[PDB]
Every structure is written in C-alpha cells, then in structure tokens.
Amino acid sequence: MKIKTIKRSADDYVPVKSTQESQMPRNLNPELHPFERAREYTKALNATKLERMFAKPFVGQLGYGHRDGVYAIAKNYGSLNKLATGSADGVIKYWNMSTREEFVSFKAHYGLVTGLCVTQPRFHDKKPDLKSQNFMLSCSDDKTVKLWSINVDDYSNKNNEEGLIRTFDGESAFQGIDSHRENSTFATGGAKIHLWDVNRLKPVSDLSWGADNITSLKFNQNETDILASTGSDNSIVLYDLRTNSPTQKIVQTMRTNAICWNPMEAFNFVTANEDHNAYYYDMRNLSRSLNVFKDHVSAVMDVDFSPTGDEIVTGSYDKSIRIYKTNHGHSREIYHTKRMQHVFQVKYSMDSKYIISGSDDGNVRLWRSKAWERSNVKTTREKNKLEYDEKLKERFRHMPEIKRISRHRHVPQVIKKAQEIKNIELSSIKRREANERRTRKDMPYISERKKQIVGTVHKYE
Amino acid sequence: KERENQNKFERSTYTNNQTKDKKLRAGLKKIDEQYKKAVSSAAATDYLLPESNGYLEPENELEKTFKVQQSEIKSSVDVSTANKALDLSLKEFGPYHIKYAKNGTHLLITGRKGHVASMDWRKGQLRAELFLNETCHSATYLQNEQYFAVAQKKYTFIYDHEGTELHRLKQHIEARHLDFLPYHYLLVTAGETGWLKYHDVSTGQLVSELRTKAGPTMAMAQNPWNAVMHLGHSNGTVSLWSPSMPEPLVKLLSARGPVNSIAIDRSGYYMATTGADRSMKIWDIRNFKQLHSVESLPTPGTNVSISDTGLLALSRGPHVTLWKDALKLSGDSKPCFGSMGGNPHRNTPYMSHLFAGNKVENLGFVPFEDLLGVGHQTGITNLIVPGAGEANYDALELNPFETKKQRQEQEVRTLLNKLPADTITLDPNSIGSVDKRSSTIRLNAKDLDVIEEALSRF
Amino acid sequence: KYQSSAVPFPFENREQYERSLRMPIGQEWTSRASHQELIKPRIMTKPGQVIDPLKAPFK
C-alpha cells in the first residue's frame, strides 16, 4: 500500500539564516478566506473613519496677511510655489509659499488693486530674464495698469531694479485683468474691456459688446486666444482674438462673479455667480449648463479648477469654501474657520494638492485639497494601503453606515441654519409646483441646467 | 485563460429571474473584463502552491484500506509525523475533551474532573496546567494560545496564557459547548439551560441571549463559512442561529431522538449530524437537501468531525471510522461499512481504529497536518490520517510557524478588522446588496333597460 | 443597515450593481498583479512638479 503524508520540512517555512524574513505561503481558496464581503466592508468603514480623523486640512496662513483684506490673487502657471496677492489698500505682495514669506511688497496703487496677474513679458527689444525676475502686473480703480518685476531666488546661476518697469494708463477705471499665455498680450476689463500688449502704452483694441461695463476676465489656458468676461448686466461674453471681436454672450438671472476655464478640456468653463451656485458651461453650446454645483448658501465669489481638470474649488460670501467633483454637482468638502471672513479669492495651486484662499480680514491661507492626505513621500506598503482604501471607500460609498460618516462635517451655525431653511423653502416650492402641475394643462418641465439662462444671442438650431 | 480549476474561484451573482447608456455600458464591460481577469489570475496560483495533499492508496485488491494499522502508518511515514502522532496517558482525571488552536500549534485538553492543560503539543512546552477541582466540561481558545475559555461546574471562566483567571462570566450559567468565532471575536455558549449566548471577547460585552426553547443543547457546531451556529436538540432538530434574530434562522429535522453530534465542512456546504437513533445524516446546507441517511449504525455515533480536505470521522464509542469522499451528492458516496461482494460503488471506510479500552470523548482534526486528535477516557491520541489536512495553508490568514511579533501584530490587525455580530447572515454575500424590498429597478422620479337608458341624465 | 437602501445612481438595476460588487479586490482574494490593477487610481500625478494645461497636435 502506497502512503504519503504532509511533509512540511521546516526549511521552506522558517529560514535558516536569522537575518532574512519568513516565507509567507499563500493559498487563494475562498474556503481559506471566508468573509470576503464583510471583511472589506469593515476595511472600508475603518477607512472612512480614519479619513474623518485624519482630516486636518489647514496648512497655514502665509506671512502676516495684508492690512485691508485680500481681493486679488494670482498664481503663476509655471512655478509651483509663487503667489501674488493684492488687498484693498493698494498693496500687492509676492509670496514664496514654501517658506510662507513675501519676496517683496509694493504700495502699488492708491485705490483698491482690483486685478493682478503674472506675465512672461515678451519684449522685442529686451530679453526676459525669467530665471531671476518674476513679473506681475496689476490694475486698479485709479485708472492705472502697472507692471512690476520681482527678484527671485530659485536658481543660483547669476551673481537689481525690482519695481515698476512700466505704467499703462487708461482714461476710466479698471476692474479685472488677465494675461494671455503667450505673445505679450493681456486684457483689462472695467468701464470697457481693452486688449493690451506690454510694448505699446495704449490699448490695441477695444472689444466691447455694448456700452455696459465688464466686471471680470479670464483668458483660456489652451486655445489661448479665447477670452471670457462677466458684465454687471448679468452677462457672460466670449471673445475671440483671431477675429478680434466678441463671439457670443448669454444673459443669466444674477451676476457672474468669476469664470475659470477647464485646463484639460479647453472649451468648458465654470462660472461662479450670485445665486448661490456654480455653472459648468460648454463654449460650443451655451443654451444649457452641463453642471450646476449647488451647495453654497450665499453669493459665490470665486471659482478655480484643479490643474487636473477633475475638481473645482469655490469660495463664497458665506465665510466658507467648498470643493466639488466636476461630475457630481454637490460639494465634496467644505472648509471654514471662525477666523476666516468672506472668502473673496480662491486659487487651486499647480500641485493640484493645495488650495489658496484669500479672505477679507487680510489673510491668505493654505489648505489641503484632500484633507486626510499627507505630503510626505510614501513607501510602497503605505502607498498600496492608501490606494486600496481609496478603492474600497469608492466601492462601498453608498452603504448607509459609511455614507453617513463620509458625508459628515461640522458647518458653522449660520450656514447650518441657512441650509435647513433653504431646505424647507425648496421643499415648499416643490410641493406648490406639484400642486400647480396637477391642475394646469401645459406646464413645461424645465431642466435645472436651463433654469438660470434668461437668454442667449446667436440662437441655436 | 481557460484554467481547468476556475469554478473553485468563481463568484456567484444576482440574476433578474443590454443597456442604452454608453458610459454605463462601457463601465459594465470593464467590470466583466476585470472579473474574468481576476478569476483567471487567481486560479493560476495552483502552480505556486508548494505542497501536495496526503493520501493512502491500496495498489492491490486484497489490500483494503480500513484494515491498515496505526503502527503500520507510523512505520511507513517519516519521523517528524511519527513524532507528531502523540499519546498522553492521563488516567486519573476524567475523559478528556480535546481542542486544537486554529493553527495546529497548541492543544487544550480538559479532564472531566478538573485537569485543564494548554500546551504546545509539538514542542514539549506546556504553558498552563491548572487543576480546577470542579467538573469541567469543555474549553476553547479564543484568538490565540494566549487566552482560553473553560466551561466549569456552572460558570464559564476565561484564563490567560499562563493560566491566571481573567474572567468569571456571571452569565453563561451552564455551558457544555463553547466555540469561538474568530473573525467576529465572539465566544458562543450553550448547554443545559436552553439558551445560546454570544459574548464579545474584545469589548467584554454579552452580545446576545437567545432562547433555544428546546431544552438543553445536545450538540453544537459552527459553520466556518458564514458563522451561524447549528445546535442539535433533544427533538432530533438542528437549528441554525444568528445573534441578530431571536428566532432560529432555520430549523431542520435531522434525526429521531436527540442529536448527538454535528459537524460542518469548512466550505459551508455539507453538515453531518449523528443522532441517538443510530443514524448518521449528511445534509446539504445551502439548499437544505438531505444528501445521505446512513441508518442503523451498530451503536450510536457519539461524534462526527470533518477535516479540511473533506474526510468524515465518525466515532461510536471505542471505534473511530473515517470515510473519504462521503460528502458528495451521488448515492455511490453513501458511507457503507462493507462492500457486499466487492462493489466499487460502495463507500467503505477510508480507515478505522479501535480504542479497545475506552469510549472516546471527542474528535478534532489537527488543522494543517494529517492527524486526527481523539480525546478519550485515558487522555489524548493523535492518529496519522493521511488524507486529512490542508497541505497549503495561507500564511496571512493563520500561520503554524508564526512568531511572537507576528502573533502580536496579527492580533491587533484582526482586532481592528473584527466583523460586527450583525453581519452574520445565512449567506455571507448579502451585505453589499440592496434590500429584497425597494424595487429592483431604480426609479427616475418621472415614475415617482330601454326605459333606464332614457332615464339616465336623472 | 449593511445593505443599501435603493440602487445607486449610475446603474439601472441591482443585477448590474451587484455585478459591480461581485469580486473582492483584496490581497487575500486576488493575485498580486490583479490586486495592483484593481487598486491603482485613475488620476496619477507626480508629487512635486507643476501640471501644465493640455496641448494637442494642432488642436
């Protein structure tokens, strides 16, 4: 009779030399591993609880802030850690966000500096030294656009006349500014929107639809010759710089405070307006928004895109900011602070990992876009654990017990009470429109994505 | 890609008794591609499996397999396995209930009189020998060799690694059967009272008290698949219980008389119950069919056990008898005792042994080795049963070579991923789904007398 | 409370949704390569360099 038993042999399972690790034999039988749904449910629940205890999003404020509340912010789209901010008392500052300290400050204007951006100024007589000088220009309500250079310690190649290399001049005030991402060009909105270049001391072209003023401006990031602007007649106007002309405008219900273009989709933009939500619009069809981001409770002051194009940040007049996944339409996250008042400017840093907010008490604050995410480099075991936990929270996302935990935040008292009376108001109007629809004959079902456009020039067929 | 052993690694799903969405269509197509890739690549691991299962095969027609002696096995197999086949002769205290840790490293014996010893049976290291002079009945380890629970005269006690008493449970009034649920951290208790008690060992909190309402609990086993408890009563009734429902999940009519013993396969598919009416019965668990009914055993089967490779060890007093491939659907797998004229379609015993002096108290297979530890009136005996253990364990579920640091970190990690007691259902895959109410289609809010004919108008 | 209330948004019926949930992505239940393919995220950025806007071959 032949016969054979289990010969475990102890050389394959506990190692000979003491310096090396033990063997881990695997056996992928589901008989060996029994509770495959419950075990990863509890791992997804422990991941959501670990996220809710690791959510420490406030990095730090930078510097000492300003004196009179920050109303303009501009990142530069080529360096990771440099940031220009301007306040109401005319002072602008250039910031190193690594050390959280200003390269330089500038008493730029006398009024409010109402816009500022950054440039690589293509002069055709001089050569731009972009490895030691940074350039920011800035418009105010004292009818001036000024262009400044900054001494920057980022390369150590060299070894110098920092401020105010030139002063453009308008006859009326300015209200917004944004620079083209090539070809020495910028545009300033104000009493009317002008286009400029850094060589000529006067506007190249006036590109105004009608005699109604312009409140904001953004250039496109790819297809760089497409401008967009917000006018105080609740209007959003697109301009093209091939045709050197406006292109199409829409009139909404309330006033668009800001625009930002999608850096990864080149025809989509997001508007941030005074009814308390944001609108994701396609340039090729402005007859309908392709999303509405709804969760704010007062007027949305500024919006910005992640450089990955996958989520937006959105600061509003209720003293809180909100981060939104672009495909959802409700807030993924809310950041607030008892010290933060009336966040007027929000940018999304080029790392896609930090969020810069300028409030109006004076302070500019860094936040993490993902609160539970730390910024060290990770060994492969902890990186694998973190993305395993992300995939697991993703596929158990809608279970009631982990949804009530991942959904949870502490919102201030004012925003919570405004939220619940907003809920009972919306439920009341849905009740009344359901009754009215039960009776009356032809009540059209208007979409939420169309419920906020009062009209559109150049009708669609 | 074909993989002749995929259906072990396959995973069942919901069916209704295709789509117009482009994005959802391609998402489901990616999901089906990923499921097929994952099943195939998970099933290709059987090349990487290190060891092979044991066996013994007759190689002749005169050489039957049930008449092969344990001394002949110990001569035919190696010295390490022959030294694992231990035998402790502990005569003065009572019949010894045997228990192994879930990796086969530690042994826990209890005398009927008072003698409880936790030991490393494969080294010569005992780490608790305590003589609790009242009649002990049963014991079990909790999540380790570091804690064990013993069922004493009335109260269940909990002892640490070296034998100091940690807890006296004021509930669990008269236990006779203890079993630990290791993924849920639950000590389950039943006995002479008609009550079933689930006690959380980690928090310390009595999770459930359930009226069996059927008198004292004659047998008790745990489904390793879905952690429901099969209790056998004096009705001939097995009942499947969960700590959520105060009623049994299922009640099966297994035997006549009482139910002497229950064993469940580790796949959670088959259950062997012995009654006191001299009847072994093999049950389908998932579909609740009765597979086999071996009636008229020569004397009532006092124990059953099922190995990790599906052997069936029945014990009828002095005799231990093991059948191979008895837990199958076909009628040619009904366990016989002889083959009447040499029928190949009769499941004769795979091997048998006679403990000629005594009557065996309980049976338990050693987890990852080819041994069957039977505890009897004069102590412990391991039997070399060659087909009777998973040769290829997983070393990150439970490891027979695990060290002190590995024990510490695995204890903290399994404590962290302890499953709640409410997730115990009859099927484990029912905690991701939707309700069996709440309609299966999601809803899109749009869906949310010629004179009397003249006298009509009046 | 361990099973969802209705069918979540992107699916149309619970057969589709449970076909999503039917395979565990764990280390214990897949191979190592399949585990890595199942847990790598969609957006993978580099941790310390600037993300520029997209540029296409002549739009």
Place this chain on the structure above:
Amino acid sequence: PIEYLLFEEPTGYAVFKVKLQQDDIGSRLKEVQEQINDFGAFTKLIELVSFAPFKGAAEALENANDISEGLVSESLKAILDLNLPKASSKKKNITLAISDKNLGPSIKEEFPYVDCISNELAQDLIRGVRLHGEKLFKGLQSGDLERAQLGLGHAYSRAKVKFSVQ
C-alpha cells in the same frame, strides 16, 4: 524639478538622480521635514548614478580648495560632462541641485545648458544625503568617509594657515 544632485565629499564627487520630487509648498510640514530623517523614504527620493573617487589626498586637497573658493575643477568637469545630458542652453536647461550659490556661476560658465539650484529644497536634499552618507553609496568607495574627513580637514587647515614643520 530638481533633476540631478551634486554631492561633494572627501572621497570624491557623487552625482545622484532625483527620482521623486519632494513637496515644494508643503516643504515646511512635519512629515516632509522628517522624511529626510527616515532612510526608508529618503531612498524613494534619491538614487546614486555616479561616483568619481579622487586620486589621493593631493587631488582631495586641490578639490577641497576649489570647492571652498567656488570653482569648478577638472574632476568636476569630467563627472558633470559624463553624467548630465546635453540639454539646450535656451530652452529647458537640465537642473542640477548644488549646495553652493557661488559655485553655481562656475558651473554655468562651463556648462551653459545647466541651471543650478541651491534653495531650501536642494539644501534639505543635500543634507539628507549628508545625513545618510555611506548607506546611499551601496558600498562603492574605498576608504572610510570619516577617516578621509579627518585627513582632509587637517590638510585643509594646515594649507590655509601655512603650517611649516621647519
């Protein structure tokens, strides 16, 4: 982008290749500041691609004086020309991380396609490789680095003071 790293040391020159950038904006945070103390995570940032050892204590003292007064020596020219790719001088230079802001101009005087960075990111990368030292080099140098440090410090000091044994 901090693509390459130049570490000068008494046994020779080392060029490292930066695998993963550390965070720029979160560079003052606690986890970023102590990942350069943990070696298991610093080896995710820095990889050694080259090490040119010196010819002896004479060339060691010559290169110690040249590194001290901020000049590119001939062994520096050799190892940088071996290791750094021929980038452009007008568009996207290759980025070398040094620790000496007045050695940088001497590096661009010799290789115009190399822009040199010594700010706080390059400083803590440099002090990470100083903190770990012999572990990064994978066994490829002759001579213990502290013994060569004792010899080079005594030689540098006696040279700088003109110590005569007459």
Place this chain on the structure above:
Amino acid sequence: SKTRYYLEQCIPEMDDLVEKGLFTKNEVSLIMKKRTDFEHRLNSRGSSINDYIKYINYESNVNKLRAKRCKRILQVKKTNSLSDWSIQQRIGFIYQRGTNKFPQDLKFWAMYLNYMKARGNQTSYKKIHNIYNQLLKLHPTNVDIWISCAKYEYEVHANFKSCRNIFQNGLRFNPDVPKLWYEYVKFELNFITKLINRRKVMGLINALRGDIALTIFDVCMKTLGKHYINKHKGYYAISDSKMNIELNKETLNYLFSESLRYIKLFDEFLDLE
C-alpha cells in the same frame, strides 16, 4: 510582497511550457518551489550576490534542460512560443536586479556583460550600450572597464569614432594610469594599420599617419609627469631643493621607464613606417 509579484510573473511561461507538451505539472511545481526559494532569498533582507549567481545558474540549467527536452519530445529546436525567450529574459532581469542592488562587484558586472554579449542575435547592442553606460558611470576610475568597452566596440563592431570617444573620455577621467595611455596608442596604431592595409588591399585588387600616436605620446609624457609630481610630494611642497631635485629626477626615471616600455612594445607594429 514582491516575491509574490515575481513568482506570478513566472506563470505564463509555464502555462505555455505545459501546453507545449514537454514539462508536466508535477515537475513544473518542483521548478516553481526552487524558484520560490530563490526569489525569496533575492528580495528579502540579508541578500547576497551569491544568491543572485546561484539563481542565474539554476535558471540557465533549467533552460538547458528545456532545450534538451524540446529536442527530444517535439523534435524542434525552438517552439517559437513564449517559453524559449522568457527564461533568458528572466536571467537578464536577475542580472539587472543584482547590479542595481550590489553595484560593486565587477565579477558580477562582467558576468552580466558576458551573458548579454553571448546571447547573440537576440540581444541588442544598444542594450549592451546601456549597461556599459551605467557601469562606466559608477566606476569611472576603474580602467579595465574603459578598455573592455572600447575593445567590444572596436574588435567586434569596428566603430572607430565611438572607440576614440571612449578612450578620450576615459583619459579625461583617470589621466594617471599609464595602462590606458598604452592601450590608446595601441588602438591608434591598430586603426592606422588597418587603414594602410585596406589601402594596400585596394591597390592589390584594383597624410593620415602615426602622428596621432605621437601626439598622444607627447601628452602622455606631459600629463603622466604632471600627475606623478602631484601624486608624490602629496600634501604640500614643504621640502628643500635637495628633495625637489630628487623628486624631479625620480619622475624623469618613472616617465622614461614607461617610454622604454613604449618602444619595447612599439617595435612589433611593423606594417607602417
């Protein structure tokens, strides 16, 4: 763990190697448990280049057994399926892993180069160029690697431009050992001899002189003298004029003995002037 990744990277070749009916399942499980032993010893702690070398020897032995079994079972010399290159690719990757972990034993680096060269038509000479580039980056001072690199790219490929570049870069790095100088004058004499012999051959069928070797001879004398006067009298010049003239005499003796060896192995090039 990463031994799990590498071990289940090994499975498609034995899928194919069981389908092509040469190995059986019970013997391929034996080669997998040996390979499990080796992969665990490789990527665990306390690892050794002898563990790498024994893994390479085991993989070459199972490759030779696979070739023998293929010729005996299928009676073809390659099945043109996965299982005839996967195992040599595995050996090349074990070599790459070992040289990334312990880049300090030139025995292992040269075993890598020998196996990669002897792999034949299936390898790529730019793949040999890559490991020459990283080996010369790690060991610039070790001079036999420069000689071996230039010898491979002249005595096999006959690439005179790249060979001149290799020798000039090596002489840039260590202009102190005379062995690299002698092998450079040897290469230049071999190149000019092949030039004038192809001239003689094209004449017999159908300006640029040894002055290259004389100019590198001249800079050989100048820089070897400079490096010996800098090597000896090491730290400072604290030595009176007796010791300075003793030093300068000794460097003249050193340099002139090397030129004596230069003429002694210069005479045997008798096909040029």
Place this chain on the structure above:
Amino acid sequence: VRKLKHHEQKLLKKVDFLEWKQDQGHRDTQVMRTYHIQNREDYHKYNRICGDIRRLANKLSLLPPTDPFRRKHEQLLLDKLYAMGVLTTKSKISDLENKVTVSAICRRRLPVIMHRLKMAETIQDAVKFIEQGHVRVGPNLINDPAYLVTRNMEDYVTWVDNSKIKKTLLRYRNQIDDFDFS
C-alpha cells in the same frame, strides 16, 4: 494588549480585555485578596446573604409600624446579627443597609479574627496554621477557614494542646509546663 496608537486609541476606545463593566471594579477579587479566601464563590454566597437581609429588612420596613410580628422580627434579626458579630452594636435598622457589608461578614471569619487578636501575625499564616490543624473553638478542632464565628466564640479561639507552636511560645516565655503535656 499593544498600548495602541493614537488613531488606535480614538478608533476603538471601549475595548478593554482586563476590566469589563460587569466586574464591578473586581471587588470580589479585591476583598478575597484582602481577607485571603481559599476558594471562589464564597464572596457570592456572602453577597446572597447581604441581599437577603436587605430584602427582608425592606419588607419589614414595608409593614406598618404597629404590629408585633414586624417589630418582633426586626428586633430578632438585629439581635441575631449582633449575636453572630456581623455588627458591633444594636443600632438603627438603617445600618442594615449602611453597615452590613460582605467585608464585615468576611471580618467574622476565623483567620481574620485570629489576626485581629494577634494569634497569628498575618492572615496568610493564619490559614497556614488552621490548615495544618492547630486551633480550636472550645473543644473541637477547626480545619476549614470558612468557619466564621459568633460573638460568643471570640473568647475560646485557642490552639490545641500538643500544638508545637504553642509549645515554642511557652518555652519562649519559659513558662513551659509539661505536666499538662504541652
């Protein structure tokens, strides 16, 4: 069990393998380490007695204050609990919930009165002596430590004669008579 990390202290706080809620602070363990009780369940067979006397004192409080059955039975209970020395005086029936303790009914045990009247010098050595069989209350030897005494028998706790430790203390004080055989 591992002195858990911080995200560990927070994620699970009610975990405690050592001390549960129903241990009541391990007062059974603490008082039997104090008064050195040999076996288990003595604490709870005293606690049942404490619960029974507070229950029947409760229902004697329930009955109206005029009937002789009630008043005779509460004075009888108070005199019996004085007579077994559980109390130290015949005071208020409020002491039948303030002053009856499982501690005091352990105070009436035989080793602890032995330590009280300095016959031993520790309660452990008292249990040593009375398991070795040296003492007696009146005529009869006492073998088990569970024999608690009454208020009359704290006077005739004495050793037996031929107890050699009694002989050693007699020859210590050299009053060792040996006509009385000890």
Place this chain on the structure above:
RNA sequence: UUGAACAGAGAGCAUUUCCGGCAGCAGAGAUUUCAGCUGU
C-alpha cells in the same frame, strides 16, 4: 518662423525589407556555442 549640411540620442511610431528554415564549405572562441557565401 523656415531651410541647409553637420553632430548625435535610444527616448518614441510603422510594415511585409530581411533574419530567428536546411545543408555544402572555410572562418571564431573556449567538444559546446559563435560568424558568411550557392540553392531548397
């Protein structure tokens, strides 16, 4: 902004241009592998 010749990198993308078929023969290195002509 384009063109030119030059110097290259291994860091991308095609496709039927050949080879990874067989001998005869000489050559190469330490009895195994390596290198080209005339046809299948």
